[PDB]
Design a protein around this ligand. Structure first.
Ligand SMILES: C[C@H](CCC(=O)NCCC[N+](C)(C)C[C@H](O)CS(=O)(=O)O)[C@H]1CC[C@H]2[C@@H]3[C@H](O)C[C@@H]4C[C@H](O)CC[C@]4(C)[C@H]3C[C@H](O)[C@]12C
Ligand SMILES: C[C@H](CCC(=O)NCCC[N+](C)(C)C[C@H](O)CS(=O)(=O)O)[C@H]1CC[C@H]2[C@@H]3[C@H](O)C[C@@H]4C[C@H](O)CC[C@]4(C)[C@H]3C[C@H](O)[C@]12C
Ligand SMILES: C[C@H](CCC(=O)NCCC[N+](C)(C)C[C@H](O)CS(=O)(=O)O)[C@H]1CC[C@H]2[C@@H]3[C@H](O)C[C@@H]4C[C@H](O)CC[C@]4(C)[C@H]3C[C@H](O)[C@]12C
Ligand SMILES: [Mg+2]
Ligand SMILES: [Zn+2]
Ligand SMILES: [Zn+2]
Ligand SMILES: [Zn+2]
Lengths: 79, 72, 50, 99, 102, 1345, 49
DNA sequence: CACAAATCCATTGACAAAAGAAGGCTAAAAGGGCATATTCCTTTTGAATTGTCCA
DNA sequence: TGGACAATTCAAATATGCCCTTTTAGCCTTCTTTTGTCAATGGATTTGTG
């Protein structure tokens, strides 16, 4: 269980962008097979997204950077 | 909360305020009045000694209480 | 057999619940006083006296 | 009592009454304002589209949930289309505009 | 007169709509049928898709089915016989009989 | 998919455009083959198939022919879900008026024709012919013409009349109306004909014509020519098992319409006479109107049973309608409910959910998880598995419950804390174990209260549960930042009893190596749980900027305080637990833990403070027993003395010294006093009664009496409810409120005779009958609030305005009743705060006032801070972050998106539960100007000071000038020293009024000697002295403290002569001695001689109604019954035509257009004269001012501070608390419309009502240009009336009267670009508030780009 | 009802607001276990097919 | 490295069942027409309008 | 002439002729086309084998 999320609301301000960033990160870790950047221990996708937030490495601008790099390297074999 | 417990507070409110009305209807400070402000008869010693400050004699007060009995 | 909560008896005003608890204890005490007489063959000449 | 999915009402495709016919729980007005108080918009959105009344959303959320993908393409709650037809069966033309 | 104000209409359910378990059943049925007809023969699995309602508009009579290969319909029914042959032994049919419950 | 909701009338070609056929027969089904019989109201040909992809007769039944129409019966083969979308239409043989546009608020058919509605209802019922531009040689169009003068006209003009009747009349009339030339002539001849009601009614009608031409409608479209029929599955004809059928009443009303229509078609075909046919059309009218709405017109058609029919308008309108009962308030899958139990072991962030509920709630989850785990091949096999409940499913379940929170919600969701996301713990049994700390937030006790579980399915719903609605993030109420996790009843008693102190218990006097040694002593029986010991404790304090510095010392504490100190975290001081720790002290402990240490440490400390309380209450053995409610000893003597007083007053009533009413009032007062004495006697006897042995001889201490322990700790009870077990339960109040004059002198430990009990049952039933009725008044003030404040949302960061309400502490005569700290805590300063010498700024402008800033402010003790307000905010369409303030469920500033409107509505609605349901109630004069001195009702005399002293009480001092009029007038208090006298004309500076107010005078009447009669020291008076002057002072020993020796005797100073006989009073045959009220210190002692006017002694010396409706009374903005009139304009006032029915009154400025006139009705008192140069927005008379004039005269910062205060008062009265962030947000939505006073240069008329945000953004662009803006006057509305006028119509139609919010919106062609929370909730898309705010923004940016 | 040996005291919060802390002796001794009865009907109707 | 022999790929014929259309049988269901006279039904609350005063 | 005063109106918390005919959709059954189960017939490709 994870009791609080008050650390994320400082890492991703405003506490609503936290929910949106975590929604997208969990869906990205559960729909498209992606490696959690954090040791999973029997824990659902939502909490793993939160823990990734608290390590300061989700940070929606970060997710957008990484997904643009994905689009590029996905369009690298785009010919 | 249990509805007997909201009901209790409602009841003690419903009587505390009524009691404060009926207890404020009685005066004790000294503004010594010696003649019925409605008629002019002298307010006696027993009457003015039961309530220091009664602005009116007994019979005029009863008439007033009746006029209030009809609310207007 | 049950563990009620004493915080209900003052705020609620049912103190008759506490009086019934006391009287029920005493009534059952006379009960177990007989029962420890009926259970050792105690000579009903004494049972009437109690 | 607990219900995941079951029967549904006739005109308004909604769940049924409580524990006699396996009915769902009401999400009244006050219980919507509570979720509006927080920012809980996807909770509220799903609780009045997918869990409740939208039909396509109803049965696609089920498949995406048993296929592990927690996500809904909600759609349009059937009670609103019922109300659209009801207002419209007066002389009132109440459209929905361009997308 | 047994709630706050509830009418007789709140209790009439819609016996037309699917069971949400049932549509998921049907979709997994489609997935299983794709699984089986993907591994089967070219001609055999093809005529099987062509003679039933498999992922297309409604079926054709055995003549209208076999016409695309031009073979006389004894040919196509003779090949669906060995189709059921391949589908008989439980190397391709355990999941399919999984749907068939009793 | 869609962007807005346009609405309008529907043209008959439009209504044909919707249909797929035309209903003709009135038949529905076939009674033997339940196919729908063509072509009635259920008909496969017109309304599509019945069974999926299948003609009716079965010619086609395949997806092959999908799209084909069966040649046999013409039924299209498609889905049967199309039965809910296709419509028909009944080609009426007779035009018929839509009842909505006829019998409504204003009759839209009427004033669009400006024909009185009675005339229309007559011309429609065929009562009268009416001309429709026949020929205007003799007659005009609207002239209603009955049969006699009509046949006259047929004589007069056989032709050129055309005299139509019924609905055909009104349709031909509307087609004959022009709207361009009509609106031109109306506006122009209302400018030419300028009167007061005339031009305003004309401007309403002209606005109607304007709207009609602006939109796309046509006037005749209100008269139906084609009537559409609902699809067949929105009015089902379902079979009930048993041959019965269930039918919508639309099937009945449509069938009635079709019967009447077919009969009329036959009639018109058959050439029936006048009466049969006209009655027929008049009767088809009735069926159309009923099918549109039943009882809006004269009669309500009832059906089979005598209840009335639920027609089309009632399917939308009302709590049983589509909007209220279905669109916002749907039922929900994935949910259940169950009884709740305690579960004292759960962490603050979890709830015990039973296995049998978690297994039926989470079925899809487990099905997918098993198909993944390979434990089941299919979903059917997985269904069988989870149905037979093998062990694998009980492990797959808790695998799916791993991080999945469920929402728990209790019955009346009052505020947002009524729904909270917990994390399940699988439980055997059937009740939902719910934490003890959230029972307060839910308002849940365990008397069988059933709570309800919902499941968040979508991943972002789970993240909103975990990240916003989780229980460990809601530990502060939003209505005020204080915690909501306060330990309630067992925890508080446990902590209290633990952290208390005996005087000589076991182990007293030891010195301990810290707290662990104290605990090892308590669990070993050496020390007592409360035992004064010197323990060394180590407190860490964050003196540094985030550094915990330790400090260790020897504290004089008890074993309990040390044992409980190891549950406190580091940053706290040890002075937080050195006390008995009541519930107030505990809540302060937790609150400052929150403030200093954050949220995670406090969310730990909140349940460690609970586990230890529960444990050390279990250890306490605290019970309650019939020897614990101890009856005082002064009870029987007390009620004896009181009953004797009652007897003597009764006898005096027998003599005729008092009236019945007054003896009753005295009896009530003396019994009330005796009940006060008894409660104080039992309290003083009970609280301290534990006297003990020191080591040592003897001592006294606060008692360990259990009924007092649970009451002093605030855990449960009070000094009042304990009074009814030991003291006496006072005088019982009848349901009217008139108290009964016989008390219940007994208590609950002693019995009660039958009449003493039957008497008390009166109020006991009134109170219960009221709290049982108060349910549906509290949840209705809150609905009004959340609809007026639905569409408000913090939608920017800083408007950048410099304006805010100047918060000063709300003092009432002395120390503040609410300090500046909590009245400015959290709101942001709108100006720099300067030190009281204005040297330099304590705090800069854009400064969120924390606890620390607020106390740095208060230490320098400022009294006025200009903070920003939502009311004076500046954002267009919303509210900026700073102007709202700090948050309250989160410590920090509010995040853009927080739907503060609903938060405010609920913060003001749920404390309404605690408010009452019905209403209830509770140093001289300095002359200014010229004039002579005049008075009346005066009765004075000259004193030994030589002055004039009025013995009278009500006498007034007027300043009358030589003209004879009043120039000044001031109340003259009792016993005033008038330095000047009567009549002498006085100028400024001559204060004829002076006194000493705080000493209530006891001034003399006669002139003679002084003595003391019935005056005794120790019994009736005190032999006191003050050393300031050293001369002894006589204070009457007041009855509340005086001895019972002379308790019934009356001290007094008697006036005598030197010879020793009494000095009578003028005209009274009784002596002149003044009995002295207690606390009157008499200056003059024996032997002295004084004349009149001598103050012989010194005496030491508001009705706020408080019901809940007083809140809704204020929020509705109601004008009171004696509203104080305001000086509408600055400048001097002057009288006019006195009593022109009422008196005339006029205020003329120093320079401006002076003649402002005012009808001041003479029966009411005035407080202005003919020479007062009064200032604007100020009273002339007095009384409850209406809020309109406040906003209109003084300023929008004066309407708020009026509303914000007068409703705060109603909350502090009953003892509630809110933040005034929550009323200023409802004030903003109320005053949210402005009336244009000047068209200016922008596109508004001279008396139009537009939203302030609309009139502001438009002109602000223009003053940004070279052009001018407009000048407006801000209007004001009630929380109901201000909400019915909203931009959206779907937003208004949902809340209040639906048939009017809709029907007006139709003629207006009004569109709806549905932005706002309610409109989006209706249409099943995301909110614009929270996690939906951002999504609505990009959609708002890809809109318009 | 049944009379049982109540004892008024706070016991580890398992009787917190209005809860009750029943012993397992009261379950073993079959004190409060009561019998309920249910009619369930099954009707043989005459469908139109 | 070649001569010979067993199982599949196609038919083909008969023929058997089945349903699609057809022709008749039959209950249902809708018309159609009535001739002593008889001629009228079965709370309280707030406010926005609208007839009725009043200065 | 024009502006207060006071009622009206509306939304919010079980049972009453009938004789006969005629034509229509429902159905009922049987042919006939239309498909589909079985009984054999030659021929590549494969395996048999020295
Ligand atoms: C019942 C209610 C509790 C709500 C739970 C409490 C809280 C506020 C109390 C009133 C105010 O204090 C003002 C006034 C003080 C006088 O001294 C005694 C009378 C008054 C009218 C009080 C009556 C009653 O005591 C009230 C209504
Ligand atoms: C006990 C409950 C009343 C509670 C107050 C009873 C009284 C009669 C019951 C309904 C009727 O049978 C009609 C209908 C039968 C159908 O089959 C489908 C169920 C229906 C809706 C029943 C539901 C419910 O059970 C009812 C309301
Ligand atoms: C009037 C009463 C309200 C409750 C009092 C309601 C409640 C449920 C209703 C009944 C059921 O729906 C179905 C039932 C089917 C039978 O075959 C014949 C009709 C029955 C008796 C219905 C008539 C009636 O409407 C009932 C009695
Ligand atoms: Mg309850
Ligand atoms: Zn008198
Ligand atoms: Zn058909
Ligand atoms: Zn602002």
């Amino acid at each position: 269980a994870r009791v609080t999320v008050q650390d994320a609301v400082e890492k991703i301000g405003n506490r609503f962008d936290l929910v949106l960033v975590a929604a997208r990160r969990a869906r990205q870790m559960q729909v498209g097979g992606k490696d959690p950047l954090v040791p999973e221990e029997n824990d659902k996708t939502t909490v793993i997204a939160l823990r990734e937030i608290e390590e300061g490495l989700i940070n929606n601008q970060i997710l957008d950077v990484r997904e643009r790099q994905e689009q590029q390297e996905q369009e690298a074999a785009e010919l | 909360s249990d509805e007997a417990d909201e009901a209790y507070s409602v009841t003690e409110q419903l009587t505390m305020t009524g009691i404060n009305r009926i207890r404020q209807k009685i005066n004790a400070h000294g503004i010594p009045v010696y003649l019925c402000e409605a008629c002019g008869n002298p307010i006696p010693e027993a009457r003015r000694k039961i309530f220091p400050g009664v602005t009116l004699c007994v019979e005029c007060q009863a008439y007033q209480e009746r006029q209030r009995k009809h609310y207007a | 057999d049950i563990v009620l909560n004493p915080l209900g008896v003052p705020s609620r005003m049912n103190i008759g619940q506490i009086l019934e608890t006391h009287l029920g204890m005493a009534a059952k005490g006379i009960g177990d006083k007989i029962n420890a007489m009926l259970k050792q063959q105690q000579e009903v000449a004494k049972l009437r006296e109690f | 009592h607990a219900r995941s999915t079951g029967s549904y009402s006739l005109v308004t495709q909604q769940p049924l009454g409580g524990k006699a016919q396996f009915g769902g729980q009401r999400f009244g007005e006050m219980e919507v304002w509570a979720l509006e108080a927080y920012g809980a918009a996807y909770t509220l959105q799903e609780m009045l589209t997918v869990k409740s009344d939208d039909v396509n959303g109803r049965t696609k959320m089920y498949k995406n949930i048993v296929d592990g993908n927690h996500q809904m393409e909600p759609g349009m709650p059937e009670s609103f289309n019922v109300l659209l037809k009801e207002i419209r069966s007066l002389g009132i033309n109440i459209e929905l505009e361009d997308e | 007169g047994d709630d706050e104000d509830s009418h007789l209409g709140d209790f009439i359910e819609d016996t037309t709509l699917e069971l949400p378990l049932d549509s998921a059943t049907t979709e997994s049925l489609r997935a299983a049928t794709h699984d089986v007809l993907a591994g089967l023969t070219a001609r055999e699995a093809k005529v099987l898709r062509m003679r039933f309602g498999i992922d297309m508009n409604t079926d054709y009579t055995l003549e209208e089915v076999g016409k695309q290969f031009d073979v006389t319909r004894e040919r196509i029914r003779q090949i669906e016989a060995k189709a059921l042959r391949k589908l008989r032994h439980p190397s391709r049919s355990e999941v399919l009989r999984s749907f068939l419950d009793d | 998919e869609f962007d807005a909701i346009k609405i309008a009338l529907a043209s008959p070609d439009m209504i044909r455009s919707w249909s797929f056929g035309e209903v003709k027969k009135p038949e529905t089904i076939n009674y033997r083959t339940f196919k729908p019989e063509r072509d009635g109201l259920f008909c496969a040909r017109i309304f599509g198939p019945v069974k999926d992809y299948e003609c009716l007769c079965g010619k086609y039944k395949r997806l092959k022919h999908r799209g084909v129409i069966c040649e046999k019966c013409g039924v299209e083969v498609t889905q049967t879900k199309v039965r809910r979308e296709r419509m028909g239409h009944i080609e009426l043989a007779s035009p018929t008026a839509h009842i909505w546009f006829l019998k409504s608020l204003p009759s839209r058919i009427g004033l669009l024709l400006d024909m009185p509605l009675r005339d229309i209802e007559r011309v429609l019922y065929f009562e009268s012919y009416v001309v429709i531009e026949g020929g205007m040689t003799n007659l005009e169009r609207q002239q209603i013409l009955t049969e006699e003068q009509y046949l006259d006209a047929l004589e007069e003009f056989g032709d050129e009349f055309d005299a139509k009747m019924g609905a055909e009349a009104i349709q031909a009339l509307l087609k004959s109306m022009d709207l361009e030339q009509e609106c031109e002539q109306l506006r122009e001849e209302l400018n030419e004909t300028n009167s007061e009601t005339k031009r305003k009614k004309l401007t309403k009608r002209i606005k109607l014509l304007e709207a009609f031409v602006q939109s796309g409608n046509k006037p005749e479209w209100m008269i139906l020519t084609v009537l559409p029929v609902l699809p067949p599955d929105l009015r089902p004809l379902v079979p009930l098992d048993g041959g019965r059928f269930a039918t919508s009443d639309l099937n009945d009303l449509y069938r009635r319409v079709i019967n009447r229509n077919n009969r009329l078609k036959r009639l018109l075909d058959l050439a029936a006479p006048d009466i049969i046919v006209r009655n027929e059309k008049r009767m088809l009218q009735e069926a159309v109107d009923a099918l549109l709405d039943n009882g809006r017109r004269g009669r309500a058609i009832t059906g089979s049973n005598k209840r009335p029919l639920k027609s089309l308008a009632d399917m939308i309108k009302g709590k049983q309608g589509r909007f209220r009962q279905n669109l916002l308030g749907k039922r929900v899958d994935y949910s259940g409910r169950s009884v709740i139990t305690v579960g004292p072991y759960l962490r603050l962030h979890q709830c015990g959910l039973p296995k049998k509920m978690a297994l039926e709630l989470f079925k899809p989850f487990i099905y997918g998880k098993l198909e993944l785990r390979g434990l089941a091949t299919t979903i059917k096999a997985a269904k069988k598995m989870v149905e037979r409940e093998e062990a694998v499913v009980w492990d797959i379940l808790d695998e799916v419950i791993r991080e999945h929170p469920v929402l728990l919600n209790r019955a009346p969701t009052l505020h947002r804390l009524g729904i909270q996301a917990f994390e399940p713990v699988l439980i055997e049994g059937k009740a939902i174990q719910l934490h003890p700390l959230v029972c307060a937030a839910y308002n849940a006790d365990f008397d069988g209260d059933q709570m309800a579980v919902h499941v968040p399915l979508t991943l972002e719903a789970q993240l909103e549960a975990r990240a916003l609605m989780m229980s460990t993030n809601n530990i502060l109420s939003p209505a005020n930042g204080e915690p909501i996790i306060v330990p309630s009843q067992d925890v508080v008693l446990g902590l209290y009893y633990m952290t208390r102190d005996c005087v000589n218990a076991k182990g007293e006097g030891m010195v301990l190596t810290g707290p662990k040694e104290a605990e090892r002593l308590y669990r070993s029986g050496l020390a007592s749980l409360h035992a004064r010991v010197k323990v060394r404790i180590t407190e860490y304090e964050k003196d540094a900027n985030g550094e915990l510095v330790a400090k260790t010392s020897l504290k004089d504490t008890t074993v309990g305080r040390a044992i409980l100190w190891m549950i406190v975290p580091k940053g706290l001081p040890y002075s937080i637990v050195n006390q008995a720790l009541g519930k107030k002290a505990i809540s302060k402990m937790l609150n400052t833990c929150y403030r200093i240490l954050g949220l995670k440490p406090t969310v730990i400390f909140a349940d460690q403070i609970m586990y230890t309380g529960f444990a050390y209450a279990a250890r306490s053995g605290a019970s309650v027993g019939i020897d614990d409610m101890v009856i005082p000893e002064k009870k029987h003597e007390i009620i004896s003395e009181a009953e004797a007083e009652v007897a003597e007053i009764q006898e005096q009533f027998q003599s005729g010294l008092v009236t019945a009413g007054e003896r009753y009032n005295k009896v009530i007062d003396i019994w009330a006093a005796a009940n006060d004495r008894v409660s104080k006697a039992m309290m003083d006897n009970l609280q301290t009664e534990t006297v003990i042995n020191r080591d040592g001889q003897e001592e006294k201490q606060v008692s360990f009496n259990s009924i007092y322990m649970m009451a002093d700790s605030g855990a449960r009870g009070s000094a009042a409810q304990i009074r009814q077990l030991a003291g006496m339960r006072g005088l019982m109040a009848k349901p009217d409120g008139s108290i009964i004059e016989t008390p219940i002198t007994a208590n609950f430990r002693e019995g009660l005779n039958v009449l003493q009990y039957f008497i008390s049952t009166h109020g006991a039933r009134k109170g219960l009958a009221d709290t049982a009725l108060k349910t549906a008044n509290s949840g209705y003030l809150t609905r009004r609030l959340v609809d007026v404040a639905q569409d408000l949302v913090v939608t920017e960061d800083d408007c950048g305005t410099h304006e805010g309400i100047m918060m000063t502490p709300v003092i009432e005569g002395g120390d503040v009743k609410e300090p500046l700290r909590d009245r400015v805590l959290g709101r942001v300063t709108a100006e720099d705060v300067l030190k009281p010498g204005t040297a330099d700024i304590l705090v800069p402008r854009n400064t969120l006032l924390h606890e620390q800033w607020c106390d740095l402010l208060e230490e320098n003790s400022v009294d006025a801070v200009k903070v920003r307000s939502v009311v004076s905010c500046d954002t267009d369409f919303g509210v900026c972050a700073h102007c709202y303030g700090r948050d309250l469920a989160r410590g920090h500033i509010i995040n853009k998106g927080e739907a503060i409107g609903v938060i405010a509505a609920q913060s003001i609605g749920e404390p309404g539960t605690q408010l009452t349901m019905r209403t209830f109630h509770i140093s001289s004069i300095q002359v200014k100007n010229k004039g002579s001195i005049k008075l009346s009702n005066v009765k004075s005399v000259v004193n030994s000071s030589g002055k004039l002293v009025i013995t009278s009480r009500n006498t007034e001092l007027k300043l009358i000038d030589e003209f004879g009029r009043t120039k000044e007038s001031y109340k003259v208090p009792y016993g005033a020293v008038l330095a000047k006298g009567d009549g002498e004309q006085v100028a400024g500076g001559e204060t004829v009024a002076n006194w000493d107010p705080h000493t209530m005078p006891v001034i003399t009447e006669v002139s003679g000697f002084v003595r003391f009669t019935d005056m005794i020291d120790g019994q009736t008076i005190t032999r006191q002295t003050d050393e300031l002057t050293g001369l002894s002072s006589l204070v009457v020993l007041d009855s509340a403290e005086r001895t019972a020796g002379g308790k019934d005797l009356r001290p007094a100073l008697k006036i005598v002569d030197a010879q020793g006989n009494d000095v009578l009073i003028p005209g009274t045959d009784m002596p002149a001695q003044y009995f002295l009220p207690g606390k009157a210190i008499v200056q003059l002692e024996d032997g002295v001689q004084i004349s009149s006017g001598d103050t012989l002694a010194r005496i030491p010396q508001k009705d706020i109604t408080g019901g809940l409706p007083r809140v809704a009374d204020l929020f509705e903005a109601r004008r009171p019954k004696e509203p104080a009139i305001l000086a509408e304009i600055s400048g001097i006032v002057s009288f006019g035509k006195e009593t022109k029915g009422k008196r005339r009154l006029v205020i003329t400025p120093v320079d401006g257009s002076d003649p402002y006139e005012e009808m001041i009705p003479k029966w009411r008192q005035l407080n202005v004269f003919e020479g007062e140069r009064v200032e604007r927005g100020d009273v002339i008379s007095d009384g409850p001012e209406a809020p309109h004039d406040i906003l209109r005269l003084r300023g929008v910062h004066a309407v708020t501070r009026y509303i914000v205060n007068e409703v705060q008062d109603v909350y502090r009265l009953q003892g509630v608390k809110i933040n005034d962030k929550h009323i200023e947000v409802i004030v903003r939505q109320m005053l949210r419309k402005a009336t244009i006073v000047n068209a200016g240069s922008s596109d508004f008329l001279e008396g139009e009502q537009v939203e302030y945000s609309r009139v502001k953004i438009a002109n602000r662009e223009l003053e940004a240009n070279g052009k001018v803006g407009a000048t407006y006057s801000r209007d004001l509305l009630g929380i109901t009336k201000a909400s019915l006028a909203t931009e959206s119509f779907i937003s208004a139609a949902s809340f209040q009267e639906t048939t009017r919010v809709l029907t007006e919106a139709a003629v207006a062609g009004k569109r709806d670009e549905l932005r706002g929370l309610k409109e989006n909730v209706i249409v099943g898309r995301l909110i614009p508030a929270g996690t939906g705010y951002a999504y609505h923004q990009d959609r708002m940016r890809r809109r318009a780009a | 009802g049944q009379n049982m040996r109540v004892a008024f005291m706070p016991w580890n919060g398992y009787n917190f607001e209005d809860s009750i802390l029943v012993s397992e002796r009261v379950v073993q001794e079959d004190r409060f276990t009561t019998i309920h009865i249910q009619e369930l009907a099954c009707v043989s109707r005459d469908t139109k097919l």
